Symmetry: C8
Subunit: 140 residues, 8 copies
């Protein structure tokens, strides 16, 4: 299955095993992590609520989570095809699709987005990424 | 029933079971949570006063609470139909109805509201949402 | 009786019973809470000095206290009838009467009050409320 | 006797009995509180040094102390009759007499006093009160 | 004796007895407090090094120390008769003589002294006092 | 093999032995450190997650890691040959290749990079280095 | 009298001459000589030398300030910075070693900022910094 | 004499010649060589080498400043930055390794800011930063 936003708990459990994170399978089930929560996973939630203590292990997790976000199918929630707009700018920018869609952004609104909003609301932590997406949104 | 602002404890208890939160039923009853308190629920009250320690569980709770706020009937307290003004801007903006109505806002007053008031007093935490409501309130 | 500013401990004890807060009768008795102290009640005093640990219980209390402050008779201390001026502007504003009257405000002085003074001295915590009262004070 | 500035420890003990604060008599005795210290009392001293833990009890104490300060005899230390100048402006302003006389203010010097000085040096905590005293002092 | 700057431990021990502070005699003796240290006594030194925990007791101490500083003989260290310059402005300003003389000030230098220097270096904590001394220094 | 970006855990373990850090082999294996994590290693990760407590030992580690980063094989991930651009500017600058490539920079994008981005996102901690790279990017 | 040239023995003798024999061995185990004595900080007294009492520390700096004021700095003050400070005010001579230690001289005085005098030279009294600044600029 | 090229043996010998034999085993267990010795910070001495006393650390940096001042930097300073700093003021030669480590030379000095000398080169004295900056601009 590829529609990560529509994933239930079972689909997340399978993904943890294919990425070598069987250690955290039961934790993700007692917390009832589904696709929506997995795509919005934060550094604090991994450490405190899921028991992922090592910062290096967390960095491995976000490495795999970024890979999943990059090749996910967002058609069921991305009406303006925001994913392929980010992808046409740079392939690694497709990971930010669900973050921008969760706070109600689309192609029509990109020119009104500020860099702080991309940080606080969309979860775009890399400044170089914010700078290129911000600039590309202005030249439309 | 659908008029959440008018909900008594029984309606909150039924709603908690329909969303799979029976585990927290007695906590919501000992605290005597009704519709007004449920609509004004903060993250600290869930953690401290209702025993919902997991931040992931809280995010699931606010996921269900945001959907309830979005499709609730506010006729008994929103006389200026502020809900449909928010809804016509974006369906997900309807959740902020009770927050704005609780601090005495209506359509007549929207153009005089600042973003700090929307953050501190109305509870609109997403910056993109505050910016969009501000712009629409000014075009009148 | 209804003149809360003139209430002694007996009237406060009766009011707690009528709002279902008999559980906190004994606490309000050892602290000797009368009408003046009840009208100037703060959240910190409820938590620390009266033993109201739950923030949800405190929010219910201020819900009832706001109802009492809104429909109280302030004739014994409000010489300029500031209560009905606030009330005619918005029903929710009549609760702030005792706070403004305690620091010596009246209709004659309202136009000289700043928004910070309303927060620090009168206890108007909602920014939208301060903004509306300030504007109305200037239109006279 | 009413000349609080000239009070020794005996007169303070009598006053504590007249306001129902016999519980704190011995604390005021070992700390050797006289009239000068009573008129300059701060909340931190009540809490830490006199053992008055309850914030509600402290608010009751300052209620009695403010009435004592308002109707006190300042003949022995108020050389410019600053008390009757404050009182003629507003009866509630007479409480600030000793705080202003202790740092050497008089009628001659009032126009040179800033609002920051009234807070830090004179102990006028209410902002609305500081603003009214400033305005009246400059219009002389 | 009145020339406090020349006091050794014996004169300080006697002064503590005449003001009713015999309880702290031993502390002042083991710490070897003489006249110079007594005139430069700070609140931190009383609390930490001399065991004066009560803030009310410290306020009583500085009440007596201010009385001693006011009527002291500064002939042995005040070449410009700075004491009588302060005294002619206001009698209680004479207490600040040793503080200003210790940092090398005199009448010749008064006109370039700033309000921060009077606070940090001379120990004039009352703002109203600093404002009048500043004004007098510029009118020379 | 010199292509550190493609290194697996086995290649990292071999490198630790060649630099005399066999003591930390087990830590690097339980944390599953590969080439990508090794090139992005931070001082906080060494101390907290890998047990390298001594700051002097950590400084020795970064000495060896900087040597590895300087002469590494970037053919598998450096599409614009950014390493040889940095190297032609100064040999010590080649260490920053993976940091810039990890956030997707290339020769085409260098002129749009700010000094804050080189610090927060690329990991160029030396200010003199950031200043020289920024200047060279502008002269193109 | 050449405090900058003092070895540990001279510091031990001076501690006895000012009534601080109680702290003699502490200054000995820490190997305090003239250079360290002239650069003594309050944190070093409390933590490393065991002088817990802040009042005792104030007595120490009272005696140390007298020593700094009348010391002979000829062996390290080539521009006679001590007598420049002294002509401005006798008590300003104590700051000589602090200013000489960070490489200052008369040639450099007009280029010194007040923050440099606070952080680097150790002139903590603001009134003193203001007076030295004014005199350094009028040259 | 070439401190940048010193291995652990030379550091152990230097500690003995300065009377710091007490800390020989610490410098050996931490494997301190010439490069680490020249980049020694106060935090590393206190936490990692066990030098608890702040006075002992000040004595150490006193000797380390002597070593840094008279070291031979030919093996890493091709622009002879050491003798440029030294000719400006003898105490400035210690900053050679700190500046050479971040790739600076005479050609680059005029582009260095005062903040860079603090954060990157380790020139903690403000008066020193001000003097080097001014001299670097007159070239």
């Amino acid at each position: 299955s590829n529609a990560v936003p529509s994933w239930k708990e079972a689909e997340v459990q399978t993904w943890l095993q294919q990425i070598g994170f069987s250690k955290y399978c039961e934790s993700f089930r007692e917390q009832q992590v589904d696709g929506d929560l997995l795509l919005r996973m934060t550094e604090e939630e991994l450490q405190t609520d899921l028991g992922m203590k090592s910062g290096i292990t967390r960095k491995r997790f976000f490495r795999e989570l970024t890979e999943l976000k990059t090749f996910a199918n967002y058609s069921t929630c991305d009406r303006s095809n925001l994913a392929d707009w980010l992808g046409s700018l740079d392939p690694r920018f497709r990971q930010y699709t669900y973050g921008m869609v969760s706070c109600g952004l689309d192609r029509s609104l990109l020119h009104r987005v500020s860099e702080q909003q991309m940080l606080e609301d969309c979860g775009i932590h890399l400044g170089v990424h914010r700078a290129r997406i911000l600039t590309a949104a202005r030249e439309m």
